[PDB]
Amino acid sequence: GLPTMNTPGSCQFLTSDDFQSPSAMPQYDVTPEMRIPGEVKNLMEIAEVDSVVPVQNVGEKVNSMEAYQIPVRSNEGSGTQVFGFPLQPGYSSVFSRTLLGEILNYYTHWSGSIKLTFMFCGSAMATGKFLLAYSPPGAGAPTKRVDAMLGTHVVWDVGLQSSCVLCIPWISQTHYRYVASDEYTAGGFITCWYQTNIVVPADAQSSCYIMCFVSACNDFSVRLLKDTPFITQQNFFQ
Amino acid sequence: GLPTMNTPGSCQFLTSDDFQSPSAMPQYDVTPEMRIPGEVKNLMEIAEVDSVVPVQNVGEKVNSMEAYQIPVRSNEGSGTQVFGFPLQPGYSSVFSRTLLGEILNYYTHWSGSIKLTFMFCGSAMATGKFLLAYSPPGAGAPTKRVDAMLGTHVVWDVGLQSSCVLCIPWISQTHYRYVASDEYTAGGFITCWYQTNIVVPADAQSSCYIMCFVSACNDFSVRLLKDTPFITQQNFFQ
Amino acid sequence: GYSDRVRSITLGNSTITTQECANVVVGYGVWPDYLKDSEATAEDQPTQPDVATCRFYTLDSVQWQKTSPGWWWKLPDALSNLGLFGQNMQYHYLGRTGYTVHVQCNASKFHQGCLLVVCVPEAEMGCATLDNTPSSVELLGGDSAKEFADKPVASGSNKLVQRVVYNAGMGVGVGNLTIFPHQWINLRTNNSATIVMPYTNSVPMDNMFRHNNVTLMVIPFVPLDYCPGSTTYVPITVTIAPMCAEYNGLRLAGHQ
Amino acid sequence: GYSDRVRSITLGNSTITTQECANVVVGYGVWPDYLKDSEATAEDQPTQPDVATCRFYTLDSVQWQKTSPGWWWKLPDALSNLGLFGQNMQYHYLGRTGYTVHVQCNASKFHQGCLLVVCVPEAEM
Amino acid sequence: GAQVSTQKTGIHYTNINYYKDAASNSANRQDFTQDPGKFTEPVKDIMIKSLPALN
Amino acid sequence: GAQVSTQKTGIHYTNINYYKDAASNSANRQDFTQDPGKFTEPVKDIMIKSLPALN
Amino acid sequence: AAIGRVADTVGTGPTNSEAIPALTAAETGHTSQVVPGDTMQTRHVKNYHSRSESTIENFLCRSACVYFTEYENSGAKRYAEWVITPRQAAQLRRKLEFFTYVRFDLELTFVITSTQQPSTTQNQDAQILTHQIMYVPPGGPVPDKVDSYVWQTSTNPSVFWTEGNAPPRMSIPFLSIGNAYSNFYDGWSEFSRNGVYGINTLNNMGTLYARHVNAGSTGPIKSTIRIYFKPKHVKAWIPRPPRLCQYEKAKNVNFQPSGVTTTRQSITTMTNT
Amino acid sequence: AAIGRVADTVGTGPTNSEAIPALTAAETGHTSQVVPGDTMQTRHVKNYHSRSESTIENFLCRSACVYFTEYENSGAKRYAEWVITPRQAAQLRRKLEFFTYVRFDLELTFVITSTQQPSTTQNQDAQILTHQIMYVPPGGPVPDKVDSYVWQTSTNPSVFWTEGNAPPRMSIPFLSIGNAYSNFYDGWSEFSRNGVYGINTLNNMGTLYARHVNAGSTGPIKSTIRIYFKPKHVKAWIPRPPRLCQYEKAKNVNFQPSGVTTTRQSITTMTNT
Ligand SMILES: CCCCCCCCCCCCCCCC(=O)O
Ligand SMILES: CCCCCCCCCCCCCCCC(=O)O
């Protein structure tokens, strides 16, 4: 009988423990593996894949394809804001239900640059230039184009190349940010403006749509595994 | 006292556990072994041995040797079905109590080809040819000979070689099938037909019998050990 | 003199051409191929019709109207009645395939819209009435698209499909369908969409009637729109070609 | 221990056995085989279903009565509705085949008769 | 002196017997020997599959 | 025969499997492989970032 | 870098070429590979961040209560029974459903607790309770009463536990009949496309049965058994969109149409309203 | 292949020889060795299926409750006694009887549980129960009362257990007087072919005795002791047909004639009816 001495923790049951345990099926012959397309090794592999962002949460539209449409049309001026949402990949309703956001919501911390790809779905004859911008926190969200261009931005010119990317560089005072909301962990404001208004010819629709895709960059990571707020129940399903 | 820490499972009693335990008979001298004919190493050794199948469950016959008899006789036509049962080595009453079936019923999964050996017990003077066939699931059991021959089959011609084999190749979408019944795990239909009716001479019985033996092939295996439904009790026997 | 806009695909006695495609999406990086001997179970000699079965089958076209919510086709199924590919499905218990899915739809420099062509593997669908499961007739459209609904579908002890587009009839965000092999037909730059899909499933082979491992979906995120003068009937045609089709377990025909 | 009386033929998912056959007659000495590239004209990739089409199809039996004169079957035709072999005939303009024709008919040491099984190529009637 | 065997899979494990009687050892769950012949095929004259069983 | 791996940090640990079935082993928490390509970028013709996606 | 490290940020400077990292074409189905330096001058950053906690294994490897029932000392329900399934709980089910097909071993943990029922029995003096959980694979005899012969378990695997001791636990191999567990199945159980439809046509994981071994006291006692799953040695294929609509039924994907996300004022509102 | 792997499927093509794999003669007593490829064109299949779970050892190596009795705190039956036998339970007995002779060591496990009996005793305050199981080999003094000198066990082996702790357990060597345990014995105990007949003429495995060591409380308590057998290091010879008719008696093979199988409509019915 080898003199032993149990220590605190003994007999407990940690949900995240990691020990060996006897098989209930001694010598069971597992079914041989098989090459199945598209294996997944890390969730970040998924978070690097673009998914369509619902920038237009506005009212009832959340219950239609319109949620994914960004209104753009010919105006009698330029400088007009086209949209504007915060950099809260986890919290903001704009991202929260995205492929990226869904994943973030199973974690507590996030870090890395993010890509916002914008595809112009107007007509071949429609043209124009937009100013995609990212303003780090500290001041308020820019309210005029002339104040947004003072920050990190990309002047996108619509043409044969349908889409254009606004890479939101990870600028932050800490290594990681909270997936949940917190002002310490404030991420800044993402806004779009008209650089040079939409200009179509006759017989070509002057009102268009712009889609927005979001995905993580190669320097993106997530920490502290937690449960999603997005799924609930009252009783075991039957 | 070596610092230790018990983990979940500690003190339990798994029926299928595998640990060392003190002998209650310290240094007991076991009786020396002896060479006894026919040792058994794996149950599959048994499942590879033919046993007579009771194809004729029909009514009261289950209580007589008749259960193991397959009626064959001279007709005024050909194409007539002679029998037909499913490929459910575990469930179907035809197999369930066989040597193969008994074993299968102690497991949950099975896989492999099966051999159905058919011995013609007519008289030396009796002749004829039968069409042994196996139709994989997907359609229904063939209802006419012309529809069964469209599947895996063997045209057996009775002669000096009394028996003939219908090897039921393991065709299936999964590696294993359930021993119990389940339509996902459907195994198909095994049927027999008259290729060219029985033809005896005068003074020779025109009504005969055909026996059916079943056994596993060298690619047969069984998984997930369980209890048989075939044995029960109400109180400890006295 | 070379442009990735142009492309041509040949499979059997059929060829397809485009002068305004994007790239070509290849499954999960995997390219279709027959089943390896170390990955099979069905012991019988399979059948590889090849040219007779792996060709381009053009389905029924469909009209893209300013309000169309979208369409969908179960794949093993959408071809179950086309040529010898179908005849092989009927005659065999087991089948295995990949497909080159080509969705065509031209407009003009003056129209606008953006379709989302996607191959969703294992697209199990929900029911309008939470206590039942959609019926075969409600899910399968075989060579004729199935339409998605612009708004919810009411309950009431029926076996209907919860065709609400923004939910892809699976209870998920329609905008997250991109994790599946896809392309976007954006009339402005695009004109067709090509996707090669490798066989997917949790088993080497499966019965082609009882199971539909992939479901093709076309769903406009940006609705069609033009102007008085521009033509109004803009169709969308789908062509699919089986790849490395193998069949095992031959028996009598019939999809019973 | 070997007898030419016994024999067994396997083609696809089907096997046949006999314990009282004669020899096996092979065409005009020639054994079936696919079309060589130096002997073809059809330029398209042919289809070789193989196991799915080259299997044993058992036709409707027939009664041999003391007065039966005989029977006959046109070959490309006799199978035009059986399995995938037929489906391929319907779907294709061109086809090419050989066949293993097996005629069965058992009686008993007490019966008597003599049939003539023959494959007549180009039997215009 | 411990021993080291292979686990079941589609890696090894260490074992040290602690008792003076072999009876105390764990089960012999890995003896995969097989000899169907004793049962299927106990014929005195070898029967060659492809041949006729009688002549 | 034990094994010795590296712990997670910004040192090693010893492991000895005690059961005859691999199923009984602890989790494989250190497989850091990654292959985004299968998902992001499943295009047949390689797309060079700095280039135009269409021409 | 370090097996699981993340990409480092490559320092960049002013540009003015015809290189267009920022211009692409989402229609291809290809996700852009742009990085900060492509559209702005960056500094160099040696990034040590690891993606260790994002591995399929670390993501699905945490015990999760997937179900629980109760059985009593005496009365009507003296033994429990549960057709094994991971789809009655929503937590774990939503994670597993992040992928189409999955393969893994499973670490089973049971939390068994008892509570004295209110009654009018005088002088109750409970003895320590001993439970028995038993697994019956599809096709095996089922218990019809707490003292059925079936609890003999000559072959069925079963655990015997006694209150006070650590939770009973045991490992389970990948039990699929196929090459991977299927999370979704857009098919039927019948070749006529009738019978069952959906994931449940594949679920044939058998049934679990619990019961007491002793009654303990004269008074009535109710015991609850919580079943926890913990996937080990995970391999997952074909990721899919995460479940959006709440779960409705346990044997199918039926849902009640839901909006794409929560709303907010206008496409200009920086607030979640 | 891999020690326990299964045969791989050899790819085959068209045949037309006088080789007759399919024709044989069951009269020989020989089982055919045909394989798919012999009667149909097959593909090649590298089969990795193992027969690991079919070894005689894995088949008989699972604890099985073979019997159980009870003894009480006080009253008439204050101690239990059981003539050792594996034939009172049907589960394990049917498996062991799959073979004529058998040889193995045995892992013994005991599940001891207590239950408070209904009485009218005021203020009951039970102390922890301690039991004692004792084995008496054929020829040894037997206890006549819970406090007989026999429970001294100076030489008899016995375990002392206390409720709460893990089930007591111990290994037992192959105890036969012969070279293997006999499962069947078509003979008598007398040379005149009188006396006993059948398996029971060989069973002389002695008796097991259980009892409490302390009464615990003033109130009455009943304890149940479950005996489990687990064969280890198994060797079996001469397989036989599995038991068909239900068991009737524990000391012989007496049965009540049973049908060969369940029935069905006609030899054409693809249904179990
Ligand atoms: C006492 C032994 C208990 C054994 C516990 C066995 C539990 C089996 C778990 C199966 C796991 C998850 C599978 C979902 C099945 C499916 O839908 O295909
Ligand atoms: C406390 C010590 C307990 C010892 C338990 C001894 C039990 C002996 C088991 C004998 C095993 C099975 C034998 C059947 C005997 C026969 O019929 O020949």
CSV table of C-alpha atoms in Angstrom, one decimal, chain B residues 77-80 82 128-132 145-146 149 153-157 192-198, chain D residues 16 56-62 102-106:
chain,number,residue,atom,x,y,z
B,77,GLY,CA,-44.9,-24.2,-65.4
B,78,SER,CA,-41.7,-22.4,-64.4
B,79,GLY,CA,-41.0,-19.0,-62.8
B,80,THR,CA,-42.7,-20.1,-59.6
B,82,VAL,CA,-39.8,-21.3,-54.0
B,128,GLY,CA,-34.0,-29.4,-62.2
B,129,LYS,CA,-32.4,-26.0,-62.0
B,130,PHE,CA,-33.2,-23.2,-59.6
B,131,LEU,CA,-32.4,-19.5,-59.6
B,132,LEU,CA,-31.0,-18.3,-56.2
B,145,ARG,CA,-38.4,-14.5,-61.7
B,146,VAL,CA,-37.8,-12.1,-64.6
B,149,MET,CA,-32.6,-12.3,-62.3
B,153,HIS,CA,-27.8,-14.4,-58.7
B,154,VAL,CA,-26.7,-18.0,-59.1
B,155,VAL,CA,-28.4,-20.4,-61.5
B,156,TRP,CA,-28.0,-23.7,-59.6
B,157,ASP,CA,-28.2,-26.9,-61.6
B,192,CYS,CA,-35.4,-18.5,-55.0
B,193,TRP,CA,-37.2,-19.4,-58.2
B,194,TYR,CA,-37.7,-22.3,-60.6
B,195,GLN,CA,-35.3,-21.9,-63.6
B,196,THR,CA,-36.5,-25.2,-65.2
B,197,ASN,CA,-39.0,-27.1,-63.2
B,198,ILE,CA,-38.3,-30.5,-61.3
D,16,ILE,CA,-24.4,-19.9,-63.5
D,56,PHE,CA,-26.9,-12.7,-66.8
D,57,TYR,CA,-30.5,-11.9,-67.8
D,58,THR,CA,-32.9,-14.8,-67.5
D,59,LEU,CA,-35.7,-14.7,-70.0
D,60,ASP,CA,-39.3,-16.2,-69.8
D,61,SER,CA,-39.2,-20.0,-69.7
D,62,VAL,CA,-41.0,-22.0,-72.4
D,102,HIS,CA,-26.9,-20.2,-71.9
D,103,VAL,CA,-29.9,-22.5,-72.6
D,104,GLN,CA,-31.0,-24.7,-69.7
D,105,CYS,CA,-33.3,-27.7,-69.8
D,106,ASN,CA,-33.1,-30.7,-67.4
